[PDB]
Scaffold this motif. Structure first.
Motif, PDB file in Angstrom:
ATOM      1  N   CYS A 164       0.833  -1.192   0.000  1.00  0.00           N
ATOM      2  CA  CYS A 164       0.000   0.000   0.000  1.00  0.00           C
ATOM      3  C   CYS A 164       0.872   1.247   0.000  1.00  0.00           C
ATOM      4  O   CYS A 164       1.745   1.400   0.859  1.00  0.00           O
ATOM      5  CB  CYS A 164      -0.916   0.004   1.224  1.00  0.00           C
ATOM      6  SG  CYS A 164      -1.921  -1.506   1.402  1.00  0.00           S
TER       7      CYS A 164
ATOM      8  N   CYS B 294      -6.397   3.889   2.918  1.00  0.00           N
ATOM      9  CA  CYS B 294      -6.037   5.252   3.280  1.00  0.00           C
ATOM     10  C   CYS B 294      -7.261   6.056   3.690  1.00  0.00           C
ATOM     11  O   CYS B 294      -7.986   6.592   2.848  1.00  0.00           O
ATOM     12  CB  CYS B 294      -5.321   5.937   2.120  1.00  0.00           C
ATOM     13  SG  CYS B 294      -3.751   5.140   1.656  1.00  0.00           S
TER      14      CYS B 294
ATOM     15  N   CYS C  31      -1.412  -3.137   5.867  1.00  0.00           N
ATOM     16  CA  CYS C  31      -1.691  -1.777   5.445  1.00  0.00           C
ATOM     17  C   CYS C  31      -3.179  -1.611   5.147  1.00  0.00           C
ATOM     18  O   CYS C  31      -3.703  -2.188   4.192  1.00  0.00           O
ATOM     19  CB  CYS C  31      -0.844  -1.399   4.230  1.00  0.00           C
ATOM     20  SG  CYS C  31      -0.954  -2.569   2.835  1.00  0.00           S
TER      21      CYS C  31
ATOM     22  N   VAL D 156       3.135  -2.670   8.782  1.00  0.00           N
ATOM     23  CA  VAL D 156       2.457  -1.937   7.701  1.00  0.00           C
ATOM     24  C   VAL D 156       2.728  -2.540   6.313  1.00  0.00           C
ATOM     25  O   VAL D 156       1.985  -2.290   5.361  1.00  0.00           O
ATOM     26  CB  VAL D 156       2.859  -0.443   7.701  1.00  0.00           C
ATOM     27  CG1 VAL D 156       4.296  -0.271   7.245  1.00  0.00           C
ATOM     28  CG2 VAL D 156       1.912   0.380   6.840  1.00  0.00           C
ATOM     29  N   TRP D 157       3.787  -3.332   6.201  1.00  0.00           N
ATOM     30  CA  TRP D 157       4.120  -3.993   4.947  1.00  0.00           C
ATOM     31  C   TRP D 157       2.968  -4.890   4.479  1.00  0.00           C
ATOM     32  O   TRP D 157       2.495  -4.760   3.351  1.00  0.00           O
ATOM     33  CB  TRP D 157       5.432  -4.774   5.088  1.00  0.00           C
ATOM     34  CG  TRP D 157       5.380  -5.940   6.026  1.00  0.00           C
ATOM     35  CD1 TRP D 157       5.049  -5.934   7.347  1.00  0.00           C
ATOM     36  CD2 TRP D 157       5.690  -7.287   5.697  1.00  0.00           C
ATOM     37  NE1 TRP D 157       5.124  -7.202   7.859  1.00  0.00           N
ATOM     38  CE2 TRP D 157       5.525  -8.057   6.861  1.00  0.00           C
ATOM     39  CE3 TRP D 157       6.088  -7.907   4.521  1.00  0.00           C
ATOM     40  CZ2 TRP D 157       5.753  -9.429   6.878  1.00  0.00           C
ATOM     41  CZ3 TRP D 157       6.315  -9.270   4.531  1.00  0.00           C
ATOM     42  CH2 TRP D 157       6.147 -10.019   5.705  1.00  0.00           C
TER      43      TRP D 157
ATOM     44  N   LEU E  92       0.432   5.371  11.045  1.00  0.00           N
ATOM     45  CA  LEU E  92       1.736   5.558  10.404  1.00  0.00           C
ATOM     46  C   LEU E  92       2.663   6.469  11.213  1.00  0.00           C
ATOM     47  O   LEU E  92       3.875   6.461  11.000  1.00  0.00           O
ATOM     48  CB  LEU E  92       1.560   6.110   8.987  1.00  0.00           C
ATOM     49  CG  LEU E  92       1.494   5.059   7.868  1.00  0.00           C
ATOM     50  CD1 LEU E  92       2.854   4.414   7.659  1.00  0.00           C
ATOM     51  CD2 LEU E  92       0.448   3.993   8.172  1.00  0.00           C
ATOM     52  N   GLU E  93       2.105   7.248  12.134  1.00  0.00           N
ATOM     53  CA  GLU E  93       2.924   8.088  13.005  1.00  0.00           C
ATOM     54  C   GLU E  93       3.535   7.268  14.136  1.00  0.00           C
ATOM     55  O   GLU E  93       4.427   7.734  14.846  1.00  0.00           O
ATOM     56  CB  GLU E  93       2.105   9.241  13.585  1.00  0.00           C
ATOM     57  CG  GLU E  93       1.950  10.419  12.641  1.00  0.00           C
ATOM     58  CD  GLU E  93       3.274  11.059  12.280  1.00  0.00           C
ATOM     59  OE1 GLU E  93       3.814  10.763  11.196  1.00  0.00           O
ATOM     60  OE2 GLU E  93       3.788  11.863  13.086  1.00  0.00           O
TER      61      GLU E  93
ATOM     62  N   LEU F 117       5.018   0.786  11.638  1.00  0.00           N
ATOM     63  CA  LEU F 117       5.827   0.657  10.429  1.00  0.00           C
ATOM     64  C   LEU F 117       6.351  -0.767  10.271  1.00  0.00           C
ATOM     65  O   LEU F 117       6.749  -1.174   9.181  1.00  0.00           O
ATOM     66  CB  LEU F 117       7.006   1.641  10.443  1.00  0.00           C
ATOM     67  CG  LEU F 117       6.692   3.080  10.013  1.00  0.00           C
ATOM     68  CD1 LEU F 117       6.140   3.111   8.596  1.00  0.00           C
ATOM     69  CD2 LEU F 117       5.723   3.744  10.978  1.00  0.00           C
TER      70      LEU F 117
ATOM     71  N   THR G 221      -0.765  10.590   7.303  1.00  0.00           N
ATOM     72  CA  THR G 221       0.134   9.757   8.091  1.00  0.00           C
ATOM     73  C   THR G 221      -0.126   9.866   9.592  1.00  0.00           C
ATOM     74  O   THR G 221       0.382   9.057  10.366  1.00  0.00           O
ATOM     75  CB  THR G 221       1.601  10.126   7.809  1.00  0.00           C
ATOM     76  OG1 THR G 221       1.748  11.553   7.798  1.00  0.00           O
ATOM     77  CG2 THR G 221       2.062   9.549   6.480  1.00  0.00           C
TER      78      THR G 221
ATOM     79  N   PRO H 217       2.170   4.843   0.780  1.00  0.00           N
ATOM     80  CA  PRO H 217       2.040   5.689   1.973  1.00  0.00           C
ATOM     81  C   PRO H 217       0.985   6.779   1.817  1.00  0.00           C
ATOM     82  O   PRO H 217       1.141   7.707   1.021  1.00  0.00           O
ATOM     83  CB  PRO H 217       3.429   6.304   2.120  1.00  0.00           C
ATOM     84  CG  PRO H 217       4.344   5.299   1.519  1.00  0.00           C
ATOM     85  CD  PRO H 217       3.581   4.669   0.387  1.00  0.00           C
ATOM     86  N   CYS H 218      -0.091   6.637   2.573  1.00  0.00           N
ATOM     87  CA  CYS H 218      -1.193   7.587   2.554  1.00  0.00           C
ATOM     88  C   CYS H 218      -0.718   8.964   3.009  1.00  0.00           C
ATOM     89  O   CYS H 218       0.135   9.073   3.891  1.00  0.00           O
ATOM     90  CB  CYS H 218      -2.295   7.084   3.485  1.00  0.00           C
ATOM     91  SG  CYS H 218      -2.618   5.296   3.332  1.00  0.00           S
TER      92      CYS H 218
END
Length: 30
Positions: A2, A28, A25, A21-22, A12-13, A18, A8, A4-5
């Protein structure tokens, strides 16, 4: 997987997010 939206500020922050997230994900939610 996916791209990166631009919104974040969500999971994602979080540095721990992280890791997964691979494969883990979500769509968004920007």
């Amino acid at each position: 997987s996916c791209p990166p939206c631009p919104c974040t500020a969500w999971c994602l922050e979080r540095p721990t997010c992280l890791r997964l997230v691979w494969r883990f994900c979500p769509p968004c939610a920007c």
